[PDB]
Design a protein around this ligand. Structure first.
Ligand SMILES: [Ca+2]
Ligand SMILES: [Hg+2]
Ligand SMILES: [Hg+2]
Ligand SMILES: [Hg+2]
Ligand SMILES: [Hg+2]
Lengths: 155, 156, 155, 156
């Protein structure tokens, strides 16, 4: 079949925050682990279940800074700008309804606080490195290094 | 990230032949597990390691009967026919270079026998069911219910 | 840009039922042309313009017989079965929520009759033939050799 | 059925360089029209027929300036950088083998000169606009507002 790992994939060293606000590296996540998610509409946090993990590799990645704290993923990531109230990407697929993510846009923290993007750069690796896409039921999002990231595998 | 699973996917029940010819359900297989692979060009068997497992859901499936034996997978699969010397799918995507898999075509067993397909059926579930795709390192193939299948995770 | 042509493509000598009631070979269809379409919802016939025509190649085709007439197309077509009230393909994509088209299933005639599928055959050409995908406005369906086929390009 | 438009698509008023060095708006190009092309290995200009035009729509677009002149396209374009000798994209797919396109990278003019990229913007539009992918035989490339662009209609 054809899968759309939409919201992209994160490097092994990326930290996912649990329902108990603890942190584990995405490559140590397992089916049924309970992670901190966010209802956009109801404007409230809530625990949800990891259904699926997909492991790929890539040599071409994207670093986003939001203060001293950063995150490394594919260019087809999806993050929430709570000030803009839009899902955004550096590289959105034509006809997804996702806005362009830019330098000095906002991300939503795992404490629901607005964080300002300080820098956005491309990043190649000498050889390919592992990347991970996790699916979360109902909310379909989580917190990668403490900011709200959407993730869904479809088709 | 748009990921093409080339071999399609198999129901959780599907038996995988391990390097040492023991059987393991595909929903038990873990990264690093050593599976009975096959070098097509060389016509020689080989042990190889699983690097990736992908789980998705489907309620539209395909049952290939080859005598009394059978395998249940997605309709876009890739089984090797050792008579025609071709990888075959019941439902090839246009201009993919995969031939139609038809009634009375041949599959390759884990021993290296030619096994004849006696029936191809559609199978529908009233609930979506879990399906599994395994990436094998070098030869990117394995024995599903005793017959040779290709599988590959490819980025687009 | 990745473009899913929902409804597949038809060979050159496939007959399209025009607005003007006459038949026309799909390889002659031009943008603006008005074809006979159907509203499944309204259960009435309508005239709609062709907004887009994709042309491609293939050597692997699907023949569907209904009475003493047939249609030739890619295996990932989409036809309406009026008996079941479902869109069907011989080869549906798992995710698509499309049902299997089978022997003795029904198609909808351009005059709203239920015609029985007598034979479905998968065949090859010695070298590729041109296949055509036509998008139709608002209804997104037309009549191929007198039976109702869906077609819609999306990203 | 599933069709990858490798090379993205251009806005209707984008200019295509014809074989005789005349210009035509891409939204007027027709099957059999002759366009200017480049062989990278031969490092010479060829003339080729357009075999296929695919028309879609988009609200997310990309503008690339090379001095006074610009080109507007989808973010999954492919332009030849003749300085680094690589096909490039603002937004390449993780496994495509395509480098990133950035400020102060180069493009190849329809007369064979390096043209420096001076600006890359990404802009939403409020209503979707028409966009056009064209298939050129043999070289699968053409000149879009005077710079070398790749385009190919491939099944998955
Ligand atoms: Ca069984
Ligand atoms: Hg980036
Ligand atoms: Hg089948
Ligand atoms: Hg068929
Ligand atoms: Hg851009």
């Amino acid at each position: 079949l054809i899968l759309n790992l939409r919201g992209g994939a994160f490097v092994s060293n990326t930290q996912i925050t649990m329902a108990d606000k603890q942190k584990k590296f995405i490559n140590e996540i397992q089916e049924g682990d309970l992670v901190r998610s966010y209802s956009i509409t109801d404007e409230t946090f809530q625990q949800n279940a990891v259904t699926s993990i997909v492991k790929h590799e890539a040599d071409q990645l994207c670093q986003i800074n939001f203060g001293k704290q950063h995150v490394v993923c594919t260019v087809n990531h999806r993050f929430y700008d709570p000030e803009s109230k839009l899902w955004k990407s550096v590289c959105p697929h034509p006809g997804s309804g996702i806005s362009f993510l830019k330098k000095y846009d906002y991300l939503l923290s795992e404490e629901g606080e607005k964080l300002q993007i300080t820098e956005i750069k491309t990043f190649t690796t000498k050889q390919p490195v592992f990347i991970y896409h996790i699916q979360v039921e109902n909310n379909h999002n989580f917190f990668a290094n403490g900011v709200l990231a959407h993730a869904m595998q479809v088709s």
